[PDB]
Structure 1
Amino acid sequence: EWQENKSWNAHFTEHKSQGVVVLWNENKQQGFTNNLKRANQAFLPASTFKIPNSLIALDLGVVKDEHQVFKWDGQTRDIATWNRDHNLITAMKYSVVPVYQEFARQIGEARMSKMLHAFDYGNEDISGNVDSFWLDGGIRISATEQISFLRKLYHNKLHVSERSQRIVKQAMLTEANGDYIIRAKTGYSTRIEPKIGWWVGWVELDDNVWFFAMNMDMPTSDGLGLRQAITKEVLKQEKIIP
């Protein structure tokens, strides 16, 4: 059911990095990882929390649809792309924390808590600020728990409308060509050690789906591009993408 493939450590080694890639072959119901222990180590979800946050926001009508504009609050922040208006598509793409903090406040802690329990999402713990707990509060999730959650979203099995699930899956769209589609979400946890980068989602093929969840040590933002590069090196080695 779960197999360790330590040869993938060569892709981390090549980039002077360390972390885990977890793959799940949906057709065969079989998982693969370079490190079973790290696969099951729970971290702050950081911006990967935008997936469940989007679903809850849409289902409660905090977000009407993927076109509704969320006005920049006019406070210049660190990331140029944050200092503008966004919709759900662009807010996901650019990981626009302030937009999702506003979602979180409107959702409120009672409903956020009930929904993470219904989703069976990581440790289901929202302790801290309703608008920052995924950055510095109690919520923790492993690579393998990310895959469990993503599988429910792919199959429209989460306790929200089909419509909410379709809209978030649209919002997750990251890459597509004639060979594959990637629906995914990046994350960078900086507020508590260890500082990690996340990439979680799935590769749609004609005849299969490969779920993936990877995290890696991210001492500085310089290595953030390694999240995708290392995941793709593994996907290429396993012949999942050309």
Structure 2
Amino acid sequence: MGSITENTSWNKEFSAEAVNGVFVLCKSSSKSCATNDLARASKEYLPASTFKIPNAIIGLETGVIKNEHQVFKWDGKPRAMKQWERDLTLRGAIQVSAVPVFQQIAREVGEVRMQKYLKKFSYGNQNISGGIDKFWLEGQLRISAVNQVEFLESLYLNKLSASKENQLIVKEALVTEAAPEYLVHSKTGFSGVGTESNPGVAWWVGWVEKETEVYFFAFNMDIDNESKLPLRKSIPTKIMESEGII
């Protein structure tokens, strides 16, 4: 990555909520990044559902996901969340974080192909052991906020080791906010409430295209209570809108 500068004043938003976390924000027009905590910016955590971004690209690249219009049919069996009990498009599955859809995609991709692509993507520690359908949820895979922004910037520029076509498909699927001159691509993540002395992690990563400017961001925080989930978006949002990226 380029240069990164620690800005301890950003901790203001974290203190107010008594949250232990990190936010990394990079402005493309300068190749510079800022963060409230340099140490945690480089610390690696379970990616949780933010892993659906590389998983989607790999699914497309390997042909497991036939094309952008593939519909993932619900077999009718009970699923962990009601929002997943329905047929979903690739964008739909990603947007509602439909774990079972991507677990099946991961099984079809397989260990060998999955490993190959995470190496090509320089994705975290590239550790997929423990079970092909859950390594990003409870396995040994880990990735840092800094590595997330590097990865997302590559995707934005279509520089990942995959077809431009597939990177573009996954990119539209990640759009979460659209205005004439304000476009946001993002993905949430939540590993769970963790265990005693081992909190879970919550994520919010993506990028913002405001006019001719582009900002890449990655946020993660320790979490042991679902009631704190909204903070994964509110803290980053307050930090960015305090930076003029309203």
Are 2:111 and 1:136 equivalent residues in the alignment?
A: no
Partner Cα separation in structure 2 for residue 26 and residue 100 of structure 1: 31
Matched residue count: 241
Offset of 1:196 from its aligned partner? 1.1
Are 2:223 and 1:218 equivalent residues in the alignment?
A: yes
Q: Which deviates further from its counterpart, 63-72 or 193-202?
A: 63-72
Aligned to 2:163: 161
Question: What root-mean-square deviation, in Å, do the aligned CA atoms of Structure 1 and Structure 2 show?
Answer: 1.3
> Of the candidates 200, 213, 233, which is equivalent to residue 228 of structure 1?
233
Unaligned runs of 5+ in 1: none
Any idea what the Cα deviations from partners look like across 1:179-201, whole Å, max 9, x if unmatched? 42110110001267321110011
Q: Secondary structure at the match of 1:214?
A: strand
Aligned to 1:209: 214
Pairing 1:17-56 to 2, within 5 Å after superposition: 17-56=19-58
Identical counterparts, % of pairs: 49
Task: Detail structure 1 runs of 4+ shifted over 4 Å in the superposition.
Answer: none
Aligned to 1:108: 110
Amino acid paired to 1:80: K
Tell me if the contact between 2:79 and 2:100 (Cα under 8 Å) persists in the aligned partners. no
Q: Which deviates further from its counterpart, 169-178 or 47-56?
A: 169-178
Q: Secondary structure at the match of 2:73?
A: coil
Offset of 1:68 from its aligned partner? 1.4
Partner Cα separation in structure 2 for residue 220 and residue 77 of structure 1: 22
Offset of 1:82 from its aligned partner? 1.0
Amino acid paired to 2:190: Y
Aligned to 1:187: 189
Any idea what the Cα deviations from partners look like across 1:127-160, whole Å, max 9, x if unmatched? 1111110011121000000011111101101111
Aligned to 1:76: 78
| TM-score, normalised relative to structure 1 | 0.96
| TM-score, normalised relative to structure 2 | 0.94
Amino acid paired to 1:203: V
Any idea what the Cα deviations from partners look like across 1:95-114, whole Å, max 9, x if unmatched? 00000000001100000000
Offset of 1:216 from its aligned partner? 1.0
Offset of 1:228 from its aligned partner? 1.2
Partner Cα separation in structure 1 for residue 199 and residue 121 of structure 2: 26
> Of the candidates 222, 237, 242, which is equivalent to residue 237 of structure 1?
242
Are 2:202 and 1:200 equivalent residues in the alignment?
A: no
Q: Which deviates further from its counterpart, 24-33 or 62-71?
A: 62-71
Partner Cα separation in structure 2 for residue 14 and residue 178 of structure 1: 33
> Of the candidates 84, 93, 96, which is equivalent to residue 94 of structure 1?
96
Q: Secondary structure at the match of 1:118?
A: helix
The structure in which a higher percent of residues are strand is 2
